[PDB]
């Protein structure tokens, strides 16, 4: 179910960019009983980052591979793992990067059907992890990769559990008492949708991370995006509720956004449709 990878099976050729708690590389894969050299994406995680031993990390990474079966078209399967001095994670090399970059670079050229479709896709993958009882703990436009412009897939799930902080994305219970539930991921989904609807703007721009906790208590939220009708922004605002059970469910989000995709011009006001 989970491929254990020898150091000679792969080699991190180029670097894609550095992460907050590690570095992301572009590499190759010459498997055990295979002679081809498959291009892969390798995630080297910094040493002593995870407060677990390699055998504890291994057994926990076995369930993040159980997710890969029966699978989901909007969930990133992990190809293999390298548990040596550091934790290295192999996945397919997606040449079109994250949706955070896609919306920032394509801002003008992006349509309304696209954003609502992406919002259904992100909720479709998150509902799958809810049903397979995995809690992402870090969902944002950065951890959602563009396979093709109409196919986004969520990556970096369970990684936060694997180690031991995105303040501007966490639900208030996660910030205050480190409580991560399936409903805390719905707060992140709302923030993630706010990122798409604001062409990659940084949430709470200006406000320090330390401040956010009190800002959410004063009932202040991310503003209504200049394309979002009150209808859509209300879905977003509902995700950011204080009582976690009161926030929408991922089944309900798929449903509400699927309805909006039928007539995207009614729910999103972009110049070009
Ligand atoms: C758009 C740039 C950005 O912010 N990105 C964040 C990011 N991370 C990764 C990535 C690299 C290597 C491995 C993984 C993984 C995983 C995983 N963990 C648990 C369960 C399932 N999968 C994630 N990428 C990335 C870059 C290029 N190709 C693929 C992924 C990005 C992009």
């Amino acid at each position: 179910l989970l491929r254990i990878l020898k150091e000679t099976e792969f080699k991190k050729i180029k670097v894609l960019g550095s992460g907050a708690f590690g570095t992301v590389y572009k590499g190759l894969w010459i498997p055990e009983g295979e002679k081809v050299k498959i291009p892969v994406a390798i995630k080297e995680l910094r040493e002593a980052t995870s407060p677990k031993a390699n055998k504890e990390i291994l057994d926990e990474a076995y369930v993040m591979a159980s997710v890969d079966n029966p699978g989901n078209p909007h969930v990133c399967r992990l190809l293999g793992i390298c548990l040596t001095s550091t934790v290295q994670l192999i996945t397919q090399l997606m040449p079109f990067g994250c949706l955070l970059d896609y919306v920032r670079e394509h801002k003008d050229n992006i349509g309304s059907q696209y954003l609502l479709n992406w919002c259904v896709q992100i909720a479709k993958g998150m509902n799958y992890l809810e049903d397979r009882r995995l809690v992402h703990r870090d969902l944002a436009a950065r951890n959602v990769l563009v396979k093709t412009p109409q196919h986004v897939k969520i990556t970096d799930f369970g990684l936060a559990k694997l180690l031991g902080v995105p303040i501007k994305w966490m639900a208030l219970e996660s910030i205050l008492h480190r409580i991560y539930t399936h409903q805390s991921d719905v707060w992140s989904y709302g923030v993630t949708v706010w990122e798409l609807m604001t062409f990659g703007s940084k949430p709470y721009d200006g406000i320090p991370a330390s401040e956010i906790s009190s800002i959410l208590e004063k009932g202040e939220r991310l503003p209504q995006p200049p394309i979002c009708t009150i209808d859509v922004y209300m879905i977003m605002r509902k995700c950011w509720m204080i009582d976690a059970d009161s926030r929408p469910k991922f089944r309900e989000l798929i449903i509400e956004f699927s309805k909006m995709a039928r007539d995207p011009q009614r729910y999103l006001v972009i110049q070009g449709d």
Side-chain angles (χ1 to χ4, degrees), residues 1-10 12-20 22-273:
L1 197 56
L2 170 87
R3 295 196 197 87
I4 325 298
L5 262 58
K6 297 149 211 50
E7 301 212 79
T8 68
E9 288 187 68
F10 70 97
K12 348 156 192 52
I13 307 160
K14 206 175 166 152
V15 184
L16 281 147
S18 188
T23 293
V24 182
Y25 298 88
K26 259 178 290 176
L28 239 55
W29 192 24
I30 324 101
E32 302 187 53
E34 283 124 275
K35 238 181 189 283
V36 312
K37 309 199 194 287
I38 308 153
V40 291
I42 318 156
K43 225 272 181 67
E44 174 164 75
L45 290 150
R46 204 194 68 95
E47 220 164 336
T49 292
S50 191
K52 297 100 178 163
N54 298 162
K55 208 60 195 58
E56 283 91 282
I57 294 170
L58 189 70
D59 311 332
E60 195 205 319
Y62 269 128
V63 185
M64 287 64 195
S66 171
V67 155
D68 310 346
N69 196 109
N72 196 83
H74 313 99
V75 159
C76 282
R77 286 161 32 247
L78 183 72
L79 312 183
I81 193 178
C82 181
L83 277 161
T84 60
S85 299
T86 52
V87 187
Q88 288 156 73
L89 300 155
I90 294 85
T91 52
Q92 235 289 309
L93 178 57
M94 320 237 62
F96 305 107
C98 54
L99 192 54
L100 180 64
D101 295 7
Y102 197 84
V103 299
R104 290 205 217 193
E105 294 157 333
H106 301 61
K107 177 245 128 67
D108 319 71
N109 330 133
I110 278 172
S112 56
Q113 176 83 33
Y114 273 115
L115 302 158
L116 298 176
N117 263 197
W118 292 330
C119 303
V120 180
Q121 292 178 112
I122 302 169
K124 270 199 196 171
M126 293 301 298
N127 192 23
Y128 173 75
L129 305 183
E130 174 161 49
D131 272 22
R132 305 281 288 149
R133 281 128 90 256
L134 190 144
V135 170
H136 213 308
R137 305 151 191 271
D138 185 37
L139 173 65
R142 349 166 285 259
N143 299 131
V144 168
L145 306 158
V146 167
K147 179 145 190 88
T148 74
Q150 53 259 83
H151 194 25
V152 277
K153 294 170 120 298
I154 306 133
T155 195
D156 277 329
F157 51 89
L159 188 116
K161 197 199 187 300
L162 208 278
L163 51 103
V165 49
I167 295 298
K168 293 167 155 200
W169 276 262
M170 308 151 66
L172 206 58
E173 69 267 28
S174 314
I175 311 169
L176 302 185
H177 300 135
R178 276 300 176 276
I179 319 156
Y180 295 86
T181 57
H182 285 89
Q183 301 301 295
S184 67
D185 271 349
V186 186
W187 185 304
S188 295
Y189 170 88
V191 172
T192 314
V193 164
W194 183 92
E195 298 199 77
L196 319 192
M197 307 296 185
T198 50
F199 298 112
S201 290
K202 285 183 164 155
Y204 310 109
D205 195 31
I207 304 105
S210 50
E211 236 163 76
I212 305 299
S213 54
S214 62
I215 277 59
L216 297 173
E217 283 176 303
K218 294 174 264 176
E220 318 166 63
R221 293 300 182 274
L222 293 177
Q224 177 177 140
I227 58 177
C228 286
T229 63
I230 254 94
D231 287 335
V232 183
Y233 173 71
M234 278 304 110
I235 299 180
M236 262 170 277
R237 176 58 248 243
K238 272 230 193 286
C239 295
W240 310 325
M241 275 175 179
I242 293 308
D243 196 65
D245 311 316
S246 308
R247 309 161 174 168
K249 269 57 129 237
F250 276 122
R251 272 215 123 248
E252 308 179 29
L253 292 169
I254 280 170
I255 254 84
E256 246 301 323
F257 277 101
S258 291
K259 287 170 56 262
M260 295 176 152
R262 309 209 219 276
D263 190 5
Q265 295 85 193
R266 191 199 307 153
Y267 306 97
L268 283 179
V269 197
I270 279 108
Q271 317 141 234
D273 39 83

